[PDB]
Write an enzyme that holds these catalytic residues in place. Sequence first.
Site, PDB file in Angstrom:
ATOM      1  CB  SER A   1      -0.662   0.130   1.038  1.00  0.00           C
ATOM      2  OG  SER A   1      -1.787  -1.194   1.231  1.00  0.00           O
TER       3      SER A   1
ATOM      4  CG  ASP B   1      -5.314  -1.373  -5.052  1.00  0.00           C
ATOM      5  OD1 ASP B   1      -5.926  -0.445  -4.548  1.00  0.00           O
ATOM      6  OD2 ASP B   1      -4.487  -2.662  -4.327  1.00  0.00           O
TER       7      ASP B   1
ATOM      8  CG  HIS C   1      -5.931  -2.313  -1.138  1.00  0.00           C
ATOM      9  ND1 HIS C   1      -4.663  -1.472  -1.871  1.00  0.00           N
ATOM     10  CD2 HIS C   1      -5.331  -1.349   0.497  1.00  0.00           C
ATOM     11  CE1 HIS C   1      -4.195  -0.978  -1.368  1.00  0.00           C
ATOM     12  NE2 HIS C   1      -4.139  -0.768  -0.125  1.00  0.00           N
TER      13      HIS C   1
END
EC number: 3.1.1.98
Length: 345
Positions: free
Chosen positions: A145, A245, A291
């Site tokens: 991330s 995503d 994610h």
Amino acid sequence: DLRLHLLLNTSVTCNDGSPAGYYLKESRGSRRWLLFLEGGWYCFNRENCDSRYDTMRRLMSSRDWPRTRTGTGILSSQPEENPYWWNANMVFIPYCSSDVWSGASSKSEKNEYAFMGALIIQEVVRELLGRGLSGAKVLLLAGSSAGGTGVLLNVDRVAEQLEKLGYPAIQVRGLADSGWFLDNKQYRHCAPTEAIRRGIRYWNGVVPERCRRQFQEGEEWNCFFGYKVYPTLRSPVFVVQWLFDEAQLTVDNVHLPVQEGLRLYIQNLGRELRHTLKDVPASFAPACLSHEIIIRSHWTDVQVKGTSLPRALHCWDRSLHLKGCPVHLVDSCPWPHCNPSCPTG
Ligand SMILES: *[C@@H]1O[C@H](CO)[C@@H](O)[C@H](O)[C@H]1NC(C)=O
């Protein structure tokens, strides 16, 4: 089973001035080092950083950090969970700077918060050299991330730092998971580009030198976007990115009976992501709505074209020293979960 070490240089701090740090599990025989950057969004002005301080304080402060953390996924020491690098020295660097790992500013009479992400990475590397990193053959800087974007922003600086410190034999590589975003049009009208523009000034954010020289003053926000910064990098970087995503969809104002306009929007997003990875030789990009992947305990489950991510990473290692050992693995099917190995939720 990773043990907390607060930085001995206590001038390198989390947002609130508490010392930054890292969790370490050493592997005595190993010359491989995995340094993982945690993610968790960012904040970009006094008001939204104050809100993050109220309800996401562990991402802004070390005061409440536990003495240990359990390594999961690529940070697991068990070969059953981590076929790739289970025996490596492992480092988890908590994200407590709220700056996508880009900041180089201290808390002071003019600054309520410190944004020191780029300096935290440098200081962790420096302090690890005395704990065995000086003997390393490979340093893999990984992250998920905001930590994945942090890899792209910092991998070449780590390489330059080790070269200048006199360790030219350590091979620095990057593994950027879920940090490859598009500055695309939203489905309905925060827009990533404006918030990062604001954040860079608020944080004193820094970007890789070659990318900085391309985009120049006022435009360094461009370097937070993988497809623009990646071509400027010299260190080998493996890119892991879900084609759909969840964070990308969130910033695009998509919240999931899909009608034609949204169907075309989602399919075009997957097509655009796939296009940006066409010339990325080491990549793993499944057609799933999800994610992050690399620190998930079931990270071994997803496959592209019958090859798992731990296998692809192993093939990448071999390529950096291949029949049936691919490293470029991008799904071509056009809708989330068209790959049957996608996570279930
Ligand atoms: C501590 O970190 C700061 C910022 O990175 C640096 O300027 C300073 O030289 C460091 N000092 C020591 C003793 O590591």
